[PDB]
Design an enzyme around this catalytic site. Structure first.
Site, short mmCIF file in Angstrom:
data_model
loop_
_atom_site.label_atom_id
_atom_site.label_comp_id
_atom_site.label_asym_id
_atom_site.label_seq_id
_atom_site.Cartn_x
_atom_site.Cartn_y
_atom_site.Cartn_z
N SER A 30 15.22 6.46 -11.46
CA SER A 30 14.19 7.22 -12.20
C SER A 30 14.18 8.65 -11.65
N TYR A 86 8.67 15.79 2.41
CA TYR A 86 8.67 17.16 1.84
C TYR A 86 8.65 17.10 0.30
N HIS A 122 0.85 -1.22 0.00
CA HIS A 122 0.00 0.00 0.00
C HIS A 122 0.87 1.26 0.00
N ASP A 124 11.20 22.25 -24.50
CA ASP A 124 11.11 20.92 -23.90
C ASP A 124 11.98 20.94 -22.64
N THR A 149 6.09 26.99 7.19
CA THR A 149 4.83 26.35 6.73
C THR A 149 3.66 27.29 7.04
N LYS A 173 3.20 30.01 4.52
CA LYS A 173 2.49 29.57 3.29
C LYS A 173 0.98 29.53 3.55
N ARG A 209 0.43 0.27 15.50
CA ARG A 209 0.55 0.16 14.04
C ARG A 209 0.88 -1.29 13.66
N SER A 217 -0.76 26.96 -4.62
CA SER A 217 -0.53 28.40 -4.87
C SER A 217 -1.21 28.81 -6.18
N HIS A 246 12.59 11.52 5.83
CA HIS A 246 11.99 12.85 6.16
C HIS A 246 12.00 13.73 4.91
C1 HEA Z 1 3.26 14.75 3.10
C2 HEA Z 1 3.74 14.04 4.05
C3 HEA Z 1 4.12 14.58 5.37
C4 HEA Z 1 4.34 15.93 5.78
C5 HEA Z 1 4.32 17.17 4.98
C6 HEA Z 1 4.68 15.77 7.21
C7 HEA Z 1 4.95 16.93 8.02
C8 HEA Z 1 5.36 16.93 9.38
N1 HEA Z 1 5.45 15.79 10.09
FE1 HEA Z 1 5.15 13.87 9.51
N2 HEA Z 1 4.98 11.93 8.84
C9 HEA Z 1 4.62 11.47 7.64
C10 HEA Z 1 4.29 12.36 6.52
C11 HEA Z 1 4.37 13.79 6.56
N3 HEA Z 1 4.66 14.53 7.66
C12 HEA Z 1 4.68 10.04 7.49
C13 HEA Z 1 4.43 9.22 6.29
C14 HEA Z 1 5.08 9.58 8.75
C15 HEA Z 1 5.25 8.18 9.23
C16 HEA Z 1 6.46 7.56 8.69
C17 HEA Z 1 6.38 6.07 9.11
O1 HEA Z 1 6.75 5.71 10.27
O2 HEA Z 1 5.90 5.26 8.26
C18 HEA Z 1 5.17 10.84 9.54
C19 HEA Z 1 5.68 10.79 10.85
C20 HEA Z 1 6.11 11.93 11.62
C21 HEA Z 1 6.81 11.83 12.92
C22 HEA Z 1 7.26 10.57 13.63
C23 HEA Z 1 6.20 10.14 14.63
C24 HEA Z 1 6.45 8.70 15.10
O3 HEA Z 1 6.70 7.75 14.23
O4 HEA Z 1 6.40 8.51 16.36
C25 HEA Z 1 6.93 13.20 13.39
C26 HEA Z 1 7.71 13.61 14.58
O5 HEA Z 1 8.00 14.78 14.79
C27 HEA Z 1 6.39 14.01 12.26
C28 HEA Z 1 6.21 15.42 12.32
C29 HEA Z 1 5.87 16.23 11.23
C30 HEA Z 1 5.90 17.69 11.39
C31 HEA Z 1 6.34 18.52 12.57
C32 HEA Z 1 5.60 18.18 10.10
C33 HEA Z 1 5.55 19.62 9.65
O6 HEA Z 1 6.17 19.70 8.38
C34 HEA Z 1 4.09 20.11 9.67
C35 HEA Z 1 4.12 21.64 9.62
C36 HEA Z 1 2.76 22.22 9.41
C37 HEA Z 1 2.03 22.89 10.33
C38 HEA Z 1 2.44 23.09 11.74
C39 HEA Z 1 0.64 23.37 9.90
C40 HEA Z 1 0.53 24.80 9.30
C41 HEA Z 1 1.16 25.83 10.17
C42 HEA Z 1 0.45 26.88 10.74
C43 HEA Z 1 -1.02 27.16 10.52
C44 HEA Z 1 1.24 27.89 11.54
C45 HEA Z 1 1.01 27.87 13.01
C46 HEA Z 1 1.40 26.58 13.70
C47 HEA Z 1 2.00 26.50 14.91
C48 HEA Z 1 2.39 27.67 15.75
C49 HEA Z 1 2.29 25.14 15.51
N4 HEA Z 1 5.69 13.24 11.29
C1 HEA Z 2 0.36 8.92 -0.51
C2 HEA Z 2 0.39 8.11 0.52
C3 HEA Z 2 -0.81 7.46 1.08
C4 HEA Z 2 -2.21 7.56 0.71
C5 HEA Z 2 -2.85 8.41 -0.27
C6 HEA Z 2 -2.86 6.60 1.66
C7 HEA Z 2 -4.25 6.35 1.60
C8 HEA Z 2 -5.03 5.47 2.41
N1 HEA Z 2 -4.46 4.77 3.40
FE1 HEA Z 2 -2.50 4.59 3.88
N2 HEA Z 2 -0.53 4.46 4.36
C9 HEA Z 2 0.51 5.10 3.84
C10 HEA Z 2 0.40 6.04 2.77
C11 HEA Z 2 -0.81 6.44 2.13
N3 HEA Z 2 -2.01 5.92 2.46
C12 HEA Z 2 1.80 4.80 4.44
C13 HEA Z 2 3.11 5.38 4.12
C14 HEA Z 2 1.49 3.86 5.48
C15 HEA Z 2 2.43 3.20 6.43
C16 HEA Z 2 2.84 1.79 5.89
C17 HEA Z 2 3.66 1.04 6.95
O1 HEA Z 2 3.20 1.00 8.13
O2 HEA Z 2 4.78 0.47 6.63
C18 HEA Z 2 0.05 3.72 5.35
C19 HEA Z 2 -0.63 2.90 6.26
C20 HEA Z 2 -2.08 2.82 6.32
C21 HEA Z 2 -2.79 2.17 7.43
C22 HEA Z 2 -2.20 1.63 8.66
C23 HEA Z 2 -1.91 0.11 8.53
C24 HEA Z 2 -1.37 -0.48 9.84
O3 HEA Z 2 -0.66 0.27 10.61
O4 HEA Z 2 -1.63 -1.69 10.10
C25 HEA Z 2 -4.21 2.29 7.08
C26 HEA Z 2 -5.33 1.88 7.96
O5 HEA Z 2 -6.46 2.23 7.73
C27 HEA Z 2 -4.26 2.99 5.79
C28 HEA Z 2 -5.43 3.24 5.04
C29 HEA Z 2 -5.49 4.11 3.91
C30 HEA Z 2 -6.80 4.41 3.32
C31 HEA Z 2 -8.10 3.80 3.69
C32 HEA Z 2 -6.51 5.34 2.29
C33 HEA Z 2 -7.51 5.94 1.41
O6 HEA Z 2 -7.62 7.31 1.81
C34 HEA Z 2 -7.09 5.80 -0.03
C35 HEA Z 2 -8.26 6.33 -0.90
C36 HEA Z 2 -7.93 6.53 -2.34
C37 HEA Z 2 -7.31 7.55 -2.85
C38 HEA Z 2 -6.85 8.67 -2.02
C39 HEA Z 2 -7.17 7.66 -4.39
C40 HEA Z 2 -5.84 7.47 -4.83
C41 HEA Z 2 -5.75 7.67 -6.31
C42 HEA Z 2 -5.52 8.77 -7.00
C43 HEA Z 2 -5.33 10.12 -6.35
C44 HEA Z 2 -5.45 8.54 -8.50
C45 HEA Z 2 -5.83 9.80 -9.22
C46 HEA Z 2 -6.08 9.59 -10.69
C47 HEA Z 2 -5.79 10.60 -11.54
C48 HEA Z 2 -5.20 11.91 -11.04
C49 HEA Z 2 -6.06 10.41 -13.00
N4 HEA Z 2 -2.95 3.22 5.26
CU LIG Z 3 9.96 13.00 9.41
#
Ligand code: HEA
Ligand code: HEA
Ligand SMILES: [Cu+2]
Ligand SMILES: CCCCCCCCCCCCCCCCCC(=O)OC[C@H](COP(=O)([O-])OCC(O)COP(=O)([O-])OC[C@@H](COC(=O)CCCCCCCCCCCCCCCCC)OC(=O)CCCCCCCCCCCCCCCCC)OC(=O)CCCCCCCCCCCCCCCCC
Ligand SMILES: CCCCCCCCCCCCCCCCCC(=O)OC[C@H](COP(=O)([O-])OCC(O)COP(=O)([O-])OC[C@@H](COC(=O)CCCCCCCCCCCCCCCCC)OC(=O)CCCCCCCCCCCCCCCCC)OC(=O)CCCCCCCCCCCCCCCCC
Ligand SMILES: CCCCC/C=C/C/C=C/C/C=C/C/C=C\CCCC(=O)O[C@H](COC(=O)CCCCCCCCCCCCCCCCC)COP(=O)(O)OCCN
Ligand SMILES: CCCCCC/C=C\CCCCCCCCCC(=O)O[C@H](COC(=O)CCCCCCCCCCCCCCC)COP(=O)(O)OC[C@@H](O)CO
Ligand SMILES: CCCCCCCCCCO[C@@H]1O[C@H](CO)[C@@H](O[C@H]2O[C@H](CO)[C@@H](O)[C@H](O)[C@H]2O)[C@H](O)[C@H]1O
Ligand SMILES: CCCCCCCCCCO[C@@H]1O[C@H](CO)[C@@H](O[C@H]2O[C@H](CO)[C@@H](O)[C@H](O)[C@H]2O)[C@H](O)[C@H]1O
Ligand SMILES: CCCCCCCCCCO[C@@H]1O[C@H](CO)[C@@H](O[C@H]2O[C@H](CO)[C@@H](O)[C@H](O)[C@H]2O)[C@H](O)[C@H]1O
Ligand SMILES: CCCCCCCCCCO[C@@H]1O[C@H](CO)[C@@H](O[C@H]2O[C@H](CO)[C@@H](O)[C@H](O)[C@H]2O)[C@H](O)[C@H]1O
Ligand SMILES: C[C@H](CCC(=O)O)[C@H]1CC[C@H]2[C@@H]3[C@H](O)C[C@@H]4C[C@H](O)CC[C@]4(C)[C@H]3C[C@H](O)[C@]12C
Ligand SMILES: C[C@H](CCC(=O)O)[C@H]1CC[C@H]2[C@@H]3[C@H](O)C[C@@H]4C[C@H](O)CC[C@]4(C)[C@H]3C[C@H](O)[C@]12C
Ligand SMILES: CCCCCCCCCCCCCCCCCCCC
Ligand code: CUA
Ligand SMILES: [Mg+2]
Ligand code: NA
Ligand SMILES: [Zn+2]
Lengths: 72, 513, 70, 227, 143, 44, 44, 56, 40, 102, 49
Positions: free
Chosen positions: B156, B244, B61, B91, B316, B319, B438, B255, B240
């Site tokens: 890629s 981003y 997934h 291009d 962030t 933005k 998890r 934007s 990490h």
């Molecule tokens: C698009 C994907 C995406 C993005 C952008 C982020 C963004 C951030 N993530 Fe996340 N993160 C994941 C995808 C993402 N994360 C995934 C996939 C994991 C799990 C990985 C795994 O174990 O599989 C994860 C896990 C993860 C962890 C590990 C937790 C754990 O495993 O125990 C932490 C720890 O700090 C973290 C923090 C953050 C923070 C601080 C941001 C920041 O960038 C967010 C900043 C944004 C804001 C704060 C909101 C807008 C701001 C405002 C409106 C201003 C005012 C706000 C304040 C004054 C607070 N994330």
């Molecule tokens: C982009 C990243 C992404 C997205 C979109 C999702 C989408 C979803 N994810 Fe998942 N998920 C992960 C990244 C993502 N996930 C990751 C990184 C983990 C951790 C794996 C690990 O633990 O090792 C995770 C784990 C995770 C768990 C935890 C499993 C566990 O800990 O045992 C669950 C449980 O409900 C879940 C459910 C879903 C569901 C129901 C959606 C639904 O919201 C999905 C619905 C469908 C869509 C959002 C459409 C997608 C298709 C398009 C957008 C195509 C568009 C077509 C054109 C533009 C032509 N996902």
């Molecule tokens: Cu991180």
């Protein structure tokens, strides 16, 4: 260009300085001074210093710099 | 002619089209995997089998959603289609290398589907931690096929990053500075720099895993003086930045969409938006060990990673507030693309804020490896990255195709998907706070209500995905040809018509100083 | 004849009025949240432990048959 | 343990878990406020026919947009780091217990005085006694003295595991070749439950942790009886 | 006025309340009577009839502000259709429960839950707020 | 090469019913694959 | 200059504007930037 | 050796519509056909190998 | 955006067929597998 | 200042040989601001429409005054009141008099 | 002239709402789904030992 280097100055460099200033101004409280031990490799006196009474270092701090004989 | 055009392409638009087709197919695979996850968890007990088949599904997934759906659609699809058009370039710098970035992905995907078909699959998590991913606890070909899948996806994206950076630096009109390029172009250049620096470190780490599995190395094996935790550092040094990479092009599309449907010529605070994306990209390299707060690191290290992670909220926030300031005073057009973008601003904010909760190492002790993390990342990925993709798709579909969508159907699609994703993920906060781990195929009885509701949510999201396929069919079926597009004076990608000719900017734009 | 109304800065005036409104609300919610969640939790823990008898708690559990060791 | 329809954390069993609850309440108030303010501002931006589409000056407003968030992060960081360092403080434990993760069960070693060790396996669903909890009970509980500072050392003899007890605020990864330390102090007698918190293969869902907290005299007699 | 795909590079007509005077007239080609009306427009507008003024407006512009800004019943179709597809989703969930899901574990039986509930109260699960806190140990009933 | 709407794509949109068939097979095969992989793993 | 009868102009109306204004310039009478009114004339 | 670049410039600029990968003559076609045959044939063999490895 | 009327209009009936065929292409194969899980 | 802004815009529209492009540029720029234009600015724009023999653009200018007022229903009828002498002199019918408010 | 929404909007809103409520109420209450609500104020505790 000048525009890029100004962008780095205000967007990266001065923010770094501000964060390190905040970091420092949070760890700025006085450390607890350690027991005086008259170690022979420290508080060296082979010739009197050419200022004061000859026995005080140039930027002597009474709170943290003991003399050969101990804290003042 | 068909082979020359579609297998031998050197054209940025056709390669973009190949990426969008590939990503859409990948999204269907990723959706099916997501429904198997939620079918397993939708009632207490065992549906499929034990945690092995379950974690094969979870692992696949994640890899499909990240490497075959989001990155190909945002970077390969929107990036190839839009970047040359937005800078008036004829291009990409390396139009033949561009085609190899695309053709590496079907084989990458084939290796991942082979991993799942041989032996018992790779039930490792997408992180592929040893020793579970090692040759004792995962004997046989599955993990090696996963490693090779990542190698091809990595090459890629590295070659694609070299292509985008070169194109964006070298192929603008000579009067155009970097501070006169659109935000989407900035978002792709920064994402490309992150890929260039992060993927080689992943390549080194998974290569070490490969040699531990097949050449009797012991990088991660304590018996030879190795350390499983070294793998975690190498993986997260990439992982990490990778998140981003997944959001930055989405920020760029948001934007453009907010500006366009606000009736504005320009986003609020352009230089602030550039500053914010460069700051996020930089900070994204110095925070990785927030994925490792429970592994046993020193307290001062945990204090540093807590503090450095929280700093990302400042750029962030600039933005988010700049998007709100773009809406301010707009002639708002309530298009389907605008609805996606407004949902993005709000839902991304919620997931960003739960990220800030997780940044606190002390609290992360209790939240780590729980559904609270799953709630955080699905708010930013399934409601952030995906909402930006859907917004960009409905906004630019008429540019790419020359045909219009049915806006009423697209609004219906938005409404169903909005309900489904919130019903799926909001309750996972409760499951995380109350301690549901998890990567579990089954849960203690107390967790039944929120898992039941979450699974029902996932079925609503499935209904949205099925409707989207019908909506694309209806557009190609009806053939409503585009006539006029508003705001071409500040949206150059539209100025060659819909679709643009195969060759655009054969004669470049005139821009004087 | 109609009076001359305010014709300039109407969007800015609306923004100023409502941002102040949101600040005032933010302060009302923080006071409410302090009261309904944060202080309620501090007082629930303080009141539970003020006269808590851990031996009496254990005796009740032991007599209910919950333990392997007692 | 968790209870049906639970929204928040399990009730705190240790002083540090109490500290984490109050820190979470403070943080969640901030999350609620920022979330609310953004939704409200979206809704304000979108509810007027009045327009202003000419170029707008950014610098004044960007000061507010950066300083206020910086202040809020400092207000989170200060109590966050106070708690981090409080957990790290020197305490003088009375007892050391080791746990080793295995596929798929925990072993415990109490070797301060005698060689006491045993395995701790999930009670199968078909063998639960009436009133017992599916997927959470073990055959051999981790009996420990209440109201005493205990050093828990965590490792593995195979793949990664993670030893967690949410109501005590505990989660320590179990890494082969590494001995990770945490401290455990229960304010109360009782039964405190946790679950393996690192993906470890086929029965990751089915290797739970049960602490049994009792008076020192009961713990000493249990210890003697387990040799 | 017929707008052609092959005209994309030429100035075009728009109805936008933020762009009140677009780059071209709605109608460029004039009949004999429309040519006479444009000549009459060079004399006093007081001499034009209401019908002539409307005709001059409709040559210059396609829709009025009132027309281009009008509300629609589209929300009814969007909300109703979204509710239909959400209802359809419940059919999939009914199908799944009937044909995919087997029995849930015996620990959900009413008598098991009654006994597990007492055992949770005996071990004082969440005694400060969450669970046992809601039980009256003095009166032997929920508070 | 052909240019314009319906010509800048590797699939035909000349017939909406042939297109429905092709889109059904394309998206349907992606959605089906994981179910058939799970079936394969269960049948060993 | 153009080798055809139309060319896209980008107008950076003031120094250091980040916003470029884009339009087709056609053979014939000078046209004006729709933002700043600057005159451009095609020389095929 | 002698500078024969001018003669190769004439060959590769000849107005014959050939793409650059075939413009050297008949040897390019042969090496193209060998390459594409090994790639497509090897890919079919890799698929057969997956079929084989997918069962015990 | 403005656009021409549909060159090949898709009537409500034609839309019901496309939507039905689309949904069935997702639901029948998954349904067949999930219905037969016990058999597997 | 407000008086200086208004004077600049009166001067713009009062240029005797103002061309069609300038008339459009002016109104399309003016409606971007956070204001409903003062009657003296509208008066000068309507007289520009007269010099350019463009009755339709005069009506459209009156519509965009109403539109810029948003929910402030008192502004448009005030501006029409102030313009009545100019509307009478030039024979400009309001959108309401032409049924273009339906 | 009246569009799809003018002609059918009221019927699409009423039918969609009625159908959605009916089928979700049936799914939630009539097919044996175990929601596992809180025992608090609901379950009479019973001797287990
Ligand atoms: C698009 C994907 C995406 C993005 C952008 C982020 C963004 C951030 N993530 Fe996340 N993160 C994941 C995808 C993402 N994360 C995934 C996939 C994991 C799990 C990985 C795994 O174990 O599989 C994860 C896990 C993860 C962890 C590990 C937790 C754990 O495993 O125990 C932490 C720890 O700090 C973290 C923090 C953050 C923070 C601080 C941001 C920041 O960038 C967010 C900043 C944004 C804001 C704060 C909101 C807008 C701001 C405002 C409106 C201003 C005012 C706000 C304040 C004054 C607070 N994330
Ligand atoms: C982009 C990243 C992404 C997205 C979109 C999702 C989408 C979803 N994810 Fe998942 N998920 C992960 C990244 C993502 N996930 C990751 C990184 C983990 C951790 C794996 C690990 O633990 O090792 C995770 C784990 C995770 C768990 C935890 C499993 C566990 O800990 O045992 C669950 C449980 O409900 C879940 C459910 C879903 C569901 C129901 C959606 C639904 O919201 C999905 C619905 C469908 C869509 C959002 C459409 C997608 C298709 C398009 C957008 C195509 C568009 C077509 C054109 C533009 C032509 N996902
Ligand atoms: Cu991180
Ligand atoms: C489209 C949507 C479709 C469906 C979506 C699914 C909805 C799920 C329904 C939840 C209802 C819960 C319930 O049974 O309520 C009874 C519940 C019983 O009250 P209680 O037992 O006194 O609970 C108080 C808690 O103990 C208070 O203490 P706690 O320690 O028990 O509290 C923790 C709890 C507290 O959180 C909540 O109560 C959640 C409120 C969310 C609002 C929606 O959990 C959270 O932290 C949730 C994290 C959320 C992340 C950030 C969300 C940003 C909000 C966006 C702002 C917009 C506002 C407008 O009543 C409520 O408080 C309502 C909730
Ligand atoms: C793990 C694997 C990873 C899978 C990834 C899948 C994604 C791949 C992405 C690339 C898509 C493929 C296109 C390139 C090569 C395809 C070869 C081929 O035969 O294609 C025919 C076929 C089109 O058939 P047509 O309508 O008969 O062709 C018109 C030609 O002009 C008429 O040309 P002609 O008359 O000269 O000859 C055409 C002739 C043959 O032409 C040739 O001479 C080609 C011979 C060699 C072709 C080698 C390439 C094979 C593709 C590799 C990718 C995998 O085609 C046929 O009629 C029969 C071909 C049958 C083979 C079908 C293969 C399609 C992809 C397979 C899907 C995945 C299957 C996995 C199974 C899973 C089991 C676990 O192309 C496609 O399959 C296209 C996709 C299907 C339509 C979906 C439309 C969805 C719309 C979504 C919207 C997103 C776009 C938004 C913007 C749009 C405006 C710009
Ligand atoms: C604040 C930023 C830095 C400031 C720099 C220094 C300020 C004063 C003097 C300037 C000259 C510095 C050059 C380096 C020379 C030697 C010592 C200077 C370093 C200094 O300032 O060190 C101080 C001692 O100075 C001492 O002895 C007293 C030193 C005064 C007399 C020094 C005389 C020696 C000069 C040597 C000249 C050689 C030149 C070489 C030329 C080469 C050409 C081929 C340290 O204070 P302290 O109390 O011991 O400890 C702190 C306790 N709280
Ligand atoms: C376990 C085994 C897994 C390994 C997987 C192997 C993956 C793929 C097989 C590789 C096949 C390579 C075939 C040669 C490719 C040459 C690319 C090249 O040389 O590309 C050039 C551009 O890249 C440039 O310059 C500079 C960049 C040149 C890059 C060369 C190719 C690199 C291949 C691997 C790189 C991995 C990175 C290692 C770091 C992690 C030329 O660009 P074109 O668009 O062609 O032309 C543009 C025209 O104007 C030229 O006249
Ligand atoms: C957080 C969302 C709230 C958005 C806040 C945006 C505020 C932007 C104000 C800047 O625009 C200004 O508006 C003034 C007219 O009022 C002009 O006179 C001034 O020249 C212009 O710069
Ligand atoms: C759970 C998440 C659910 C999301 C719900 C989505 C709701 C769907 C809205 C569709 O309804 C229509 O929306 C139009 C806009 O899309 C309105 O335009 C009208 O109102 C606007 C002013 O607000 C104007 O901009 C337009 O000119 C005007 O026609 C129109 O009247 C209305 O029927
Ligand atoms: C131009 C298109 C590309 C052409 C594709 C050519 C495919 C034909 C390859 C022949 O197949 C071989 O068969 C051998 C069996 O005869 C195998 O030997 C190996 O497997 C044997 C199994 O008995 C063992 O003896 C040893 O492992 C080893 O000799 C070997 O793996 C395998 O390659
Ligand atoms: C997560 C995505 C999936 C969501 C849920 C899918 C919704 C269900 C769609 C219907 O799928 C079908 O259901 C039939 C049963 O209703 C099955 O027939 C089976 O059952 C019939 C009735 O017992 C027999 O007549 C048939 O022979 C037998 O194959 C049939 O195979 C299957 O394709
Ligand atoms: C100097 C540079 C570019 C200005 C330009 O050439 O247009 C601008 C763009 C974004 C600006 C930054 C952002 O607006 C975010 C911060 C805002 C604060 O008010 C000052 C520091 C702050 C970090 C700014 C410093 C500086 O003014 C930046 C970095
Ligand atoms: C005779 C020949 C002239 C080349 C020419 O100008 O065409 C010379 C010039 C430089 C020579 C090469 C260089 O002198 C370096 C090498 C020297 C070795 O002794 C022989 C091989 C060696 C690699 C030479 C081969 C050959 O004789 C070259 C290539
Ligand atoms: C094109 C260079 C612009 C420099 C912007 C500097 C401000 C951002 C600082 C953080 C990242 C710098 C990394 C380069
Ligand atoms: Cu042991 Cu998970
Ligand atoms: Mg972990
Ligand atoms: Na399950
Ligand atoms: Zn200009």
């Amino acid at each position: 260009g000048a525009r890029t280097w100004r962008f780095l100055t205000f967007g990266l460099a001065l923010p770094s300085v501000a964060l390190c200033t905040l970091n420092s101004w949070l760890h700025s409280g006085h450390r607890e001074r350690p027991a005086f031990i008259p170690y022979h490799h420290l508080r060296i006196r082979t010739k009197p210093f050419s200022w004061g009474d000859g026995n005080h270092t140039f930027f002597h701090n009474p709170r943290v710099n003991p003399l050969p004989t101990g804290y003042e | 002619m068909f082979i020359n055009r579609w297998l031998f392409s050197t054209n940025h638009k056709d390669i973009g089209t190949l990426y969008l087709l590939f990503g859409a197919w990948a999204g269907m695979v990723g959706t099916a995997l997501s429904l198997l996850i939620r079918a397993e968890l939708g009632q207490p007990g065992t549906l499929l089998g034990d945690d092995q088949i379950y974690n094969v599904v979870v692992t696949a997934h994640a890899f499909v959603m990240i490497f075959f759906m989001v990155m190909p659609i945002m970077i390969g699809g929107f990036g190839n289609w839009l970047v040359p058009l937005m800078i008036g370039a004829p291009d990409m710098a390396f139009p033949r290398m561009n085609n190899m970035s695309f053709w590496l992905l079907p084989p990458s995907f084939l290796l991942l589907l082979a991993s799942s078909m041989v032996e018992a699959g790779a039930g490792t998590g997408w992180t592929v931690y040893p020793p579970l991913a090692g040759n004792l606890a995962h004997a046989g070909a599955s993990v090696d096929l996963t490693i090779f899948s990542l190698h091809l996806a990595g090459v890629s994206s590295i070659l694609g990053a070299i292509n985008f950076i070169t194109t964006i630096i070298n192929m603008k009109p000579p009067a155009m500075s970097q501070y006169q390029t659109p935000l989407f172009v900035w978002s792709v250049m920064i994402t490309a720099v992150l890929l260039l620096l992060s993927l080689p470190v992943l390549a080194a780490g998974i290569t070490m895993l490969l040699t531990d599995r097949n050449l009797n190395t012991t990088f991660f094996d304590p018996a030879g003086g190795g350390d499983p935790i070294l793998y975690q550092h190498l993986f997260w040094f990439f992982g990490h930045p990778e998140v981003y990479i997944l959001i930055l092009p989405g920020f760029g599309m948001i934007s453009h969409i907010v500006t366009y449907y606000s009736g504005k010529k320009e986003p609020f605070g352009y230089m602030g938006m550039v500053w914010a994306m460069m700051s996020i990209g930089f900070l994204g390299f110095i925070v990785w060990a927030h994925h490792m707060f429970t592994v046993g690191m020193d307290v001062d290290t945990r204090a540093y990673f807590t503090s450095a992670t929280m700093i990302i909220a400042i750029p962030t926030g600039v933005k988010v507030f700049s998007w709100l300031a773009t809406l301010h005073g707009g002639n708002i057009k309530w298009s389907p693309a605008m609805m996606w973008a407004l949902g993005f601003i709000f839902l991304f904010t919620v997931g960003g804020l739960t990220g800030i909760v997780l940044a606190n190492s002390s609290l992360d002790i209790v939240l780590h490896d729980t559904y609270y993390v799953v709630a955080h990342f699905h708010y930013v990925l399934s409601m952030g990255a995906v909402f930006a993709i859907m917004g960009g798709f409905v906004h630019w579909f008429p540019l790419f195709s020359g045909y219009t969508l049915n806006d009423t159907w697209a609004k219906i699609h938005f409404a169903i998907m909005f309900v489904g994703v919130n019903m799926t993920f909001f309750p996972q906060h409760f499951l995380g706070l109350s301690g549901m781990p998890r990567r579990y195929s089954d849960y203690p009885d107390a967790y039944t209500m929120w898992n039941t509701i979450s699974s029902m949510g996932s079925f609503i999201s499935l209904t949205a995905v099925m409707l989207m396929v019908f909506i694309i069919w209806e557009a190609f079926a009806s053939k409503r040809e585009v006539l006029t597009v508003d705001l071409t004076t500040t949206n150059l990608e539209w100025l060659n018509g819909c679709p643009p000719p195969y060759h655009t900017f054969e004669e470049p734009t005139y821009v004087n100083l | 004849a109609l009076a001359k109304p305010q014709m300039r800065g109407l969007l800015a005036r609306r923004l100023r009025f409502h941002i102040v409104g949101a600040f005032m609300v933010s302060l009302g919610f923080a006071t409410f949240y302090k009261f309904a969640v944060a202080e309620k939790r501090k007082k629930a823990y303080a009141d539970f432990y003020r006269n808590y008898d851990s031996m009496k708690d254990f005796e009740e559990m032991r007599k209910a048959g919950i333990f392997q060791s007692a | 343990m968790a209870y049906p329809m639970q929204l928040g954390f399990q009730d705190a069993t240790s002083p540090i878990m109490e500290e984490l609850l109050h820190f979470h309440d403070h943080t969640l108030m901030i999350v609620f406020l920022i979330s609310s303010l953004v939704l409200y501002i979206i809704s304000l931006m979108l509810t007027t026919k009045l327009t202003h589409t000419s170029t707008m000056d950014a610098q004044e407003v960007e000061t507010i947009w950066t300083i206020l968030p910086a202040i809020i992060l400092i207000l989170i960081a200060l109590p966050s780091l106070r708690i981090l360092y409080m957990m790290d403080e020197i305490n003088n434990p009375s007892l050391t217990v080791k746990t080793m993760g295995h596929q798929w069960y925990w072993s415990y070693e109490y070797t301060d005085y005698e060689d006491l060790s045993f395995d701790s396996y999930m009670i199968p669903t078909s063998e639960l006694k009436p009133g017992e909890l599916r997927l959470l009970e073990v055959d051999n509980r981790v009996v420990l003295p209440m109201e005493m500072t205990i050093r828990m050392l965590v490792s593995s003899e195979d793949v990664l595991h993670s030893w967690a007890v949410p109501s005590l605020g505990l989660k320590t990864d179990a890494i082969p070749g590494r001995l990770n330390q945490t401290t455990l102090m229960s304010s109360r007698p009782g039964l405190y439950y946790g679950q393996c918190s690192e993906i470890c293969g086929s029965n990751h869902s089915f290797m739970p942790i049960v602490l049994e907290l009792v008076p020192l005299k009961y713990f000493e007699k249990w210890s003697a009886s387990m040799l | 006025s017929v707008v052609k795909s092959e005209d994309y590079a030429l100035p075009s007509y728009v109805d936008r309340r933020d762009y009140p005077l677009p780059d071209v007239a709605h109608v460029k080609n004039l009949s004999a009577s429309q040519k006479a009306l444009k000549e009459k427009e060079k004399a006093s507008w007081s001499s034009l009839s209401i019908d002539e003024k409307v005709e001059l407006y409709r040559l210059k512009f396609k829709e009025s502000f009132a027309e281009m800004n009008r509300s629609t019943n589209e929300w009814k179709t969007v909300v109703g259709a979204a509710m239909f597809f959400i209802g359809f989703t419940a059919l999939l969930l009914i199908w799944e429960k009937h044909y995919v899901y087997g029995p849930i574990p015996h620990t959900f039986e009413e008598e098991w839950v009654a006994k597990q509930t007492k055992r949770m109260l005996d071990m004082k699960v969440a005694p400060i707020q969450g669970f046992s806190a809601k039980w009256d140990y003095d009166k032997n009933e929920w508070k | 090469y052909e240019e314009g709407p319906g010509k800048n794509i590797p699939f035909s949109v000349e017939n909406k019913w042939r297109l429905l068939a092709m889109m059904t097979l394309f998206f349907g095969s992606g959605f089906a694959a994981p179910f058939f992989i799970v079936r394969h793993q269960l049948l060993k | 200059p153009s080798i055809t009868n139309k060319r896209i102009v980008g107008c950076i109306c003031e120094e250091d504007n980040s916003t470029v204004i884009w339009f087709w310039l056609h053979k014939g009478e000078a046209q004006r930037c729709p933002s700043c009114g600057t005159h451009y004339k095609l020389v095929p | 050796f002698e500078n024969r670049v001018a003669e190769k410039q004439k060959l590769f600029q000849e107005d014959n519509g050939l793409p650059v990968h075939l413009k050297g003559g008949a040897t390019d076609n042969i090496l193209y056909r060998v390459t594409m045959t090994l790639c497509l044939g090897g890919t079919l063999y890799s698929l057969y190998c997956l079929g084989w490895a997918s069962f015990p | 955006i403005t656009a021409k009327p549909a060159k090949t209009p898709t009537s409500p009936k034609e839309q019901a067929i496309g939507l039905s065929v689309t949904f069935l292409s997702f639901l029948l194969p998954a349904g067949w597998v999930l219905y037969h899980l016990d058999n597997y | 200042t407000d008086e200086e802004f208004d004077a600049r815009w009166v001067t713009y529209f009062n240029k005797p040989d103002i061309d069609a492009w300038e008339l459009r540029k002016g109104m399309n720029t003016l409606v971007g601001y956070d204001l409903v234009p003062e009657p003296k600015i509208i008066d000068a724009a309507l007289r520009a429409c007269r010099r350019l023999n463009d009755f339709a653009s005069a009506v459209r200018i009156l519509e965009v005054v109403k539109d810029k007022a948003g929910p402030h229903k008192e502004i448009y009828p005030y501006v029409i009141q102030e313009l009545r002498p100019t509307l009478n002199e030039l024979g400009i019918s309001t959108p309401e008099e032409l049924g273009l408010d339906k | 002239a009246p569009d799809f929404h003018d002609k059918y909007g009221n019927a699409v809103l009423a039918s969609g709402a009625t159908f959605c409520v009916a089928v979700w109420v049936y799914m939630a209450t009539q097919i044996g789904i175990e929601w596992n609500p809180s025992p608090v104020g609901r379950v009479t505790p019973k001797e287990w030992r």
